[PDB]
Amino acid sequence: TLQEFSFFDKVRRVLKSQEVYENFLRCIALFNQELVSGSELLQLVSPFLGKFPELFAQFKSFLGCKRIGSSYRALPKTYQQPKCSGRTAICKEVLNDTWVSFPSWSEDSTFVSSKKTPYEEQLHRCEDERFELDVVLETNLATIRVLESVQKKLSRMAPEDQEKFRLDDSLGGTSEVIQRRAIYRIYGDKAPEIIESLKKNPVTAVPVVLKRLKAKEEEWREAQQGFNKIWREQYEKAYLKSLDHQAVNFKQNDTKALRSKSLLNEIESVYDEHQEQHSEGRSAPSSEPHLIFVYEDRQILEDAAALISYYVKRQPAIQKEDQGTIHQLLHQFVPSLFFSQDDVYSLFFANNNWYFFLRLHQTLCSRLLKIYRQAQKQLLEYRTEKEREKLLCEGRRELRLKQPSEVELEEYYPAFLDMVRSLLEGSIDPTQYEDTLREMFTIHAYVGFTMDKLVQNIARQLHHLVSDDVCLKVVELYLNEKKRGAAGGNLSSRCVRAARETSYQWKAERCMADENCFKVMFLQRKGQVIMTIELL
Amino acid sequence: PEELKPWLVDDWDLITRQKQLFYLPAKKNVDSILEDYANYKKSRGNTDNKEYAVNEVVAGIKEYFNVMLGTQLLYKFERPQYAEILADHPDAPMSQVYGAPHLLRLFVRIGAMLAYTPLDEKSLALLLNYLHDFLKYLAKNSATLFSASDYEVAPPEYHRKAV
Amino acid sequence: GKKKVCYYYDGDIGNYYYGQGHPMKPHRIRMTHNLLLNYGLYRKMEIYRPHKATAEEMTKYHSDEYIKFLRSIRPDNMSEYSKQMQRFNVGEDCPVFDGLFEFCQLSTGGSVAGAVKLNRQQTDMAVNWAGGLHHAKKSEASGFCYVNDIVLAILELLKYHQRVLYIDIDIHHGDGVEEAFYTTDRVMTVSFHKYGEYFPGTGDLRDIGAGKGKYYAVNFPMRDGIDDESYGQIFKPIISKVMEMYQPSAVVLQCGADSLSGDRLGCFNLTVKGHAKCVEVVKTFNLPLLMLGGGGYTIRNVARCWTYETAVALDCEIPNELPYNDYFEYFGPDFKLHISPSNMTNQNTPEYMEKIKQRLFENLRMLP
């Protein structure tokens, strides 16, 4: 009947592509050749219609040697299994005998430049450099201790049986190789001769080898002291920078991601995504937003305002009148859009430049916020760690560096803000700025690495906002419509003024008919404000 | 000049894609299959005097299985197999031990290699007819003789020994 | 409450040299003990000298040819063994050094004797940091492991424990351990490992056993940069469900330290505290536990992790300041017990965790 035709037409509208429909029809045709059962048929149809409950429900009502795993495969039946002598009953009844996996790769593969920073390679090289010298020194010291023990033993019996004493391959130790390895390392090619001498006549041979081993141990110890002195101020210069895996990458991806075109295309991708979904006719309301962000502090809002005004007050290409205009726009209008002067929403119909400014401000506020929570977390962690370590009995429960005091930790953020300001002047070199930021804020310091460029971008946005007549017309229209009360207000009264709101919409359509227009919703809740941006 | 050859792909797939080697002493070695050929086909004609050629050409296949196997008949993964065969049983019949799957490959190769020998028209016609008959009988009982179910896999030791 | 545990060390194990530039370094173990000696942990712990495991004990899982070759191989007779050297996968990846069989004997004997004492009910917790070599096969050496002492330890435990659970938190997949117990119902191998262009390339989600051992081998593939919070959110529920369905009698926990942040060949981003949270979770369940070593290639982080989880096994809290020791300058420039994670991207997305965890849960539902 026509119901099946409607079903096929709607799977047509929701699949968007002929070939995937073709695979669907191959599925049902393989079913029609009696090669597929009903349960199997609904199991193959699931990938196609697994996201449309109505489609799946209607379709269901309409219907009414071997190898396993992925890395295990079997041994031959007529394979001579390697015999084992220690097989008990549990060994036969438990151990695997038919299935085998194979290592497709090998350890220590091409991983040097895969995901490690160049400053981790220096630390690793230092680590193996230390390991070589320490392992040889410890082998030497272990042989020294064993030979000292055997000499102490031989010192205690009668002389007439000293010549009768002999030593085996272990050279008095618990291993047959370690002592010989150390003696070989010490003596080079003449190791067999001295080994034979100490095995045949230990009494006259152990003291001299002790003397040589002790002398080499002392010389190696002083060499190790110098080598360790060199080894420091290399861990210091590389540890924190190796813990930071994103700084070099973050710099470039951020200096690119903050351009106007990137911000535009980020929202344009969502626009075409939702347009394609609408073309599909999928179950999504035609009032949902496109991006959401959140501001969770007003103090950070005034801090950001202070930062942008602090930059713009030191700018030569902008006059006093325009400085005043930017001051009014930032410290009066932006709070008003944020309702700084529940269920309270504000609507703002924005052009391209306003969206660029305001997204950049959101990013700045979020980064300042992340640094702020990081500082609070460091303060709390330091306090709780001090409280925990104060009451600690260590083993009874049966140089270094001076950590900054609490006052410095709580003044980190004011110092951080002053340092960002100093970077804005240029009075501080960015390299020392990065080093200081990392040394305070560990692995989360990279968030504040490109603050200055973001701030100048916002300054350019503000200057262009003042300079272009479209922005002044937009803000004047916003003020005029707010005077009537249609633009923004109480959530309940929306239906009272929605039509009036539509009128505002109409004016936007007749003010930037040749330009992109965004709808921005600022909704206040529990002290935070969620921003909500979509295109039209 | 082959009929119903796709079987080869299976061989290829299990031998250089699935990594599942062939049995060393599987069964029915190639000379034995050739002799079964002579016995079955000599019982076809009423008066086959030209059997004076049948065994001959069948014998020919054996000698063409002798020098040519291993050079341009096996694969890179099959190289350790032939290395073990030639290191363990050199004095044993070389044209033996290996199974039927390898045999057909020869007829795959000769179709190109024969392009380098200028025989006479009658001789080449007779040879082409005989290989056509050979692969037609192999097509008649491919299922009975060819069986990929007994294809064991290479442990990583064989993986190292191969490449 | 406080319970009597076991600690195994042979002081010669650190002197064994794997080779120049080799990431595998036994030296770590030694200074782990050094830290144990300088945190005052020897008074509440009993340290034992592991007897060298005889070749007969090793042949319980490996072929006699393999043990023969391991005992008769030396660096000075490389030319007379080359063919078998190729046949047994000892070579570039797993080099032969001086006293290789002695190192294997010590590592295996520690685990075997710990399993024996756990079997005798003389203790309920045994630790062997020198062991944990899980990549060894029946007749081959791979993944820097020559003798799979975990297999032998579990075989020793099986004489008195009906069911045993092996947990692997090393970044590598415990291919040897799971393969040795792929087709048995007496062992379940829970593994968490990085998958995808990573050694050994085995350990898919669909590798769930064979025959009678079906659904008794569960693997968790991960991506790069897993962190402590995700590891905690996906270890506790999975382990709780595993031991709710299985109800095991013994546990073997492989403490691979190569899943820590900054490991030379590792890729994860865990910390010492997050690594030890696994031991705390397993210890909360109060069953005979054998803690083993394994991976760990950033030596200082290995020492810190192993000493911290050794203290955790004793229900002891040690000061976060590292005491002066013979290898103190290794732990610079902070000289602090716990390490800080890196800011590397966590490619392990939450929905991927939810899907893998749900599949593992449904797989575990099918146990009798």
Add this chain to the structure above:
Amino acid sequence: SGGLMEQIQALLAPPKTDDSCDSCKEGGDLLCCDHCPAAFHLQCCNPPLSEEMLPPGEWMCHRCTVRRKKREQKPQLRRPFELLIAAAMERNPTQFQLPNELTCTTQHELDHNGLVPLPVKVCFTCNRSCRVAPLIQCDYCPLLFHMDCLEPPLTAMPLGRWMCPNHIEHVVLNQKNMTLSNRCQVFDRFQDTVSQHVVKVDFLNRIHKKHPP
């Protein structure tokens, strides 16, 4: 680049005392002829060259050896079979190759500067673009899938030809004992059969009837 290894190694030193094979077209351990630039594997010779067989000195390939020996010298199918035996002897051990008749037969990524392309193509499960996560394109149909949207999700990049979960070939790949060729012929049974609208609608309503005919 101040390396500290050399000083340690010299300090620890004991005193002591005073590109491809020409035959198989693949890499590995190769021996190069000293007369021609061609190189051969140790297992690409007639007979294959073992480790203990190579002579001390210059090594020569088979073609150059034949040229050198030629310069120095300067209805019975028995005769055809002698010709084949000689030709097979003359041939080099390169490889076995199946005929080419049988073995034979970008837009969804960020731009160079890094940017979502327009118009966009999206995930089949979410209809969301590559911005959230990289998209993988099925090589048989241009349906794009996410890593995490699969069931079960993929852990890593599929380095080879990836088979999408919508293609029906999964149920034919379910078998694990059938030979490859049968599976391939079943796959190709659905690689050409298209344009069947009337017949499938007719079959589906025929099956739809609650009471069988």
